[PDB]
Design a protein around this ligand. Structure first.
Ligand SMILES: [Mg+2]
Ligand SMILES: [Mg+2]
Ligand SMILES: [Mg+2]
Ligand SMILES: [Mg+2]
Ligand SMILES: [Mg+2]
Ligand SMILES: [Mg+2]
Ligand SMILES: [Mg+2]
Ligand SMILES: [Mg+2]
Ligand SMILES: [Mg+2]
Ligand SMILES: [Mg+2]
Ligand SMILES: [Mg+2]
Ligand SMILES: [Mg+2]
Ligand SMILES: [Mg+2]
Ligand SMILES: [Mg+2]
Ligand SMILES: [Mg+2]
Ligand SMILES: [Mg+2]
Ligand SMILES: [Mg+2]
Ligand SMILES: [Mg+2]
Ligand SMILES: [Mg+2]
Ligand SMILES: [Mg+2]
Ligand SMILES: [Mg+2]
Ligand SMILES: [Mg+2]
Ligand SMILES: [Mg+2]
Ligand SMILES: [Mg+2]
Ligand SMILES: [Mg+2]
Ligand SMILES: [Mg+2]
Ligand SMILES: [Mg+2]
Ligand SMILES: [Mg+2]
Ligand SMILES: [Mg+2]
Ligand SMILES: [Mg+2]
Ligand SMILES: [Mg+2]
Ligand SMILES: [Mg+2]
Lengths: 49, 80, 48, 115, 50
RNA sequence: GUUACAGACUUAAGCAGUGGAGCAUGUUAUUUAAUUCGAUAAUCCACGACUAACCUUACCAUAUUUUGAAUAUUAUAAUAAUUAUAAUUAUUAUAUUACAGGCGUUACAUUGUUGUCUUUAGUUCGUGCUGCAAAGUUUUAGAUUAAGUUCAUAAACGAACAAAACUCCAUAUAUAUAAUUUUAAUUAUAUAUAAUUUUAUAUUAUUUAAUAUAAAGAAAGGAAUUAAGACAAAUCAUAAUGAUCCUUAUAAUAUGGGUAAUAGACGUGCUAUAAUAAAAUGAUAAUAAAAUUAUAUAAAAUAUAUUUAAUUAUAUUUAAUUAAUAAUAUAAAACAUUUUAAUUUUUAAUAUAUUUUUUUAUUAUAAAUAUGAAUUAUAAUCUGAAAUUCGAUUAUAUGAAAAAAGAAUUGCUAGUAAUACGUAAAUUAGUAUGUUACGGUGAAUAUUCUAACUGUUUCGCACUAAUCACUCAUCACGCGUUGAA
């Protein structure tokens, strides 16, 4: 899909920033389980129109 | 205590036994002010590594014990 | 902090019915077992 | 002795434990315990009006107090990690650790300093 | 009092870990159903925490 | 170790500096019982470290701990809470093993994060089309922009991560709220609106685009965001984890010492080398902003240094406020009078006079200061339990070097640089020449030539873990085969 939001692009509603660095619509996270080989992690990032 | 009021910097020592019988006082204090009550007592003041033997003269009365046990070795350069 | 805080030990005390699993502890135990298996276990401690 | 590192049996702090942290915490507890006493001794020592022998005795007592009674000995550690450099008092955290927490949203309000 | 606020947020963080620990169950060493949970959000009103 | 264009603090102007001096701080080297460990081309060197007396610390000397910080297993015993003298539980104690623990080693095992290329403009997917095909087109013939943003053209048409935009600060306007004693309404803060400005006349080049002029507007910046890839770039010392090694020791605690050692060297700074510049003074207290004060901010006033008093520094003692209310805190340069050696370019004795805080005459006034503040001596004070190694003030003395700095080299185009302009906080019990922040006053200059380094491009390519690439021959070591003799 896409990570830009087109509701903010052509309307009165403006985008806002969570902790002044994450576009409101975005939500980012990671979780780092240990393996036999060692450490690894899994970033996820969703957009939500 | 440096300031004239509230001084001197006093520490507990085996002083009276040294006075009775010449047994050197092995100090690891180094911040105890020398007093008039111990001039002519043998001190063995710590140097970090090894205890240093000193006989306290009347010129030392104002000073700290650690001032007479120099911790670092005298610097030199290996001219190579 | 507050030293009396709930721990995994207690999560057995409060709720015996629920068979909980502390994951980090279990992992550690598995690692220890693996070490024992391949001759890399801890040496037996001296008592004297 | 064997069963504990320090003289007094103190509890472990919750969350991140470390040897240095343990050492600090115990010290803080002992300071808290023997705060009033130390103050009283100090007062007795630094007195022009009181008998001199008494003030000397108080000074000796203060000198003989252990490592763990000393207020000056306390050092603000990070609570999340166990670091002791650039430890901000408003969230008892180390510099990097604070930043990590801040960006996540653990310090509720903290946020990026945009101006 | 910011000290108190700090103590509260520490507590909250500690509770999160506890909750995470709780979330994984066992059923007579047969099935280990790992319930995934989000990071908790703690709402501190004057009256009550939620 | 290649073409070609375009770009900017790249260069050129310009302003201030570094490079010389002394000090501060980091690094190196060497020293040391230990000088803990890492960072060490751009992309290390007031960096990790927003404060090394003890502690922090990891290092060293000497002491002393050995299931220790955890979790679980197995037993004896003791205390407390609950119930209606017994029991259930929770804990503690003594042990008991598995272990715990490790700033030990490897960021050439990792995570996360960060630096540099980089706010640079690149980095790719559906459908269609081209090529037997890997692939190509799209993603560019032009041009332009800050720009893979755009119009011209094109077998393409759309679509993503970047760019831009939304965001924050600041600005202008409107509305709301504040009984205008928490007032600063000249404010603060929520919610809007506002511009990546618009319009028209002309003059050049081809309906548009740059210049100029005009009328309409408060309309002009900064911050965050720094893609893909790469550099086996940095970090196992924020933290965590793989493997590996230590387990009476490479784990744990105390007392002291060290991290502050000093030949030479290297960065960053600070203070200087005096008159387009330094010092005294300036109470109807000339003019700020931003931020801190329950691990506090400390006002007024008294006392001593100090015959008046003010200043500055301590002590005495806490008024007020945990804060639009009180305190830190009368901002400072500015501007004004005075003084200022080098300077017989001045002074003081006489006269002198329509230059009188002054003039003229005649007499005598003969390379570091009345610059600088290193270095040291003594006395006090501050913090702390403790100031010797090893902290910060004040006083009385001490008064090095340094005469605007070689080749070379750093930052900066505007509220920027500059400033002998000050102010605040983070880290502290205590110490900023550092860091992060705030206002004050406020400039000079300007693009064409060449080095570099980024885009994209030309040509080449035997490289594809992709130039730390690939790769050629002798010589040296073994085991065959076939010649000559
Ligand atoms: Mg130049
Ligand atoms: Mg030189
Ligand atoms: Mg110099
Ligand atoms: Mg290491
Ligand atoms: Mg080093
Ligand atoms: Mg130590
Ligand atoms: Mg282990
Ligand atoms: Mg260690
Ligand atoms: Mg990494
Ligand atoms: Mg390394
Ligand atoms: Mg292509
Ligand atoms: Mg391209
Ligand atoms: Mg943008
Ligand atoms: Mg008003
Ligand atoms: Mg990138
Ligand atoms: Mg490497
Ligand atoms: Mg690397
Ligand atoms: Mg590791
Ligand atoms: Mg660790
Ligand atoms: Mg050890
Ligand atoms: Mg250092
Ligand atoms: Mg620097
Ligand atoms: Mg001057
Ligand atoms: Mg006052
Ligand atoms: Mg006030
Ligand atoms: Mg004033
Ligand atoms: Mg000279
Ligand atoms: Mg001077
Ligand atoms: Mg001066
Ligand atoms: Mg401290
Ligand atoms: Mg300024
Ligand atoms: Mg271009």
């Amino acid at each position: 899909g896409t990570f830009n939001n087109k509701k903010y692009l052509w309307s009165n509603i403006n985008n806002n920033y969570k902790l002044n660095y994450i576009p409101s619509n975005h939500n980012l996270y990671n979780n780092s389980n240990i393996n036999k080989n060692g450490k690894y992690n899994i970033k996820v990032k969703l957009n939500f129109i | 205590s440096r300031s004239v009021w509230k001084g001197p910097n006093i520490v507990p020592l085996p002083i009276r036994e040294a006075m009775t019988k010449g047994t050197p006082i092995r100090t690891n204090a180094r911040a105890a002010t020398i007093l008039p009550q111990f001039v002519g007592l043998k001190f063995q003041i710590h140097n970090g590594k090894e205890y240093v033997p000193i006989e306290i003269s009347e010129d030392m009365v104002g000073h700290k014990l650690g001032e007479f046990a120099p911790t670092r070795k005298r610097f030199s350069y290996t001219q190579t | 902090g507050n030293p009396d805080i709930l721990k995994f030990r207690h999560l057995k005390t409060l709720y015996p019915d629920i068979e909980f699993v502390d994951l980090e502890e279990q992992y550690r135990l598995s690692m220890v077992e693996a070490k024992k298996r391949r001759g890399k276990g801890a040496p037996k401690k001296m008592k004297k | 002795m064997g069963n504990f590192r320090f003289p007094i049996k103190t509890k472990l702090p919750p969350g991140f434990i470390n040897a240095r942290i343990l050492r600090d915490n115990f010290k803080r507890q002992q300071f808290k315990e023997n705060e009033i006493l130390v103050k009283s001794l100090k007062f007795i020592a630094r007195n022009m009006n009181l008998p001199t022998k008494l003030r000397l005795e108080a000074q000796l007592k203060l000198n003989a107090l252990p490592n763990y009674m000393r207020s000056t000995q306390i050092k603000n550690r990070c609570v999340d990690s166990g670091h002791a450099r650039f430890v901000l008092s408003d969230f008892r955290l180390c510099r990097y650790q604070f930043r990590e927490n801040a960006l996540k949203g653990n310090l509720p309000g903290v946020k990026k300093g945009i101006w | 009092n910011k000290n108190m606020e700090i103590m509260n947020t520490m507590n909250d963080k500690l509770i999160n870990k506890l909750l995470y620990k709780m979330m994984t169950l066992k059923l007579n060493n047969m099935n280990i159903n790992k319930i995934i949970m989000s990071k908790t959000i703690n709402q501190h009103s004057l009256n009550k925490l939620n």
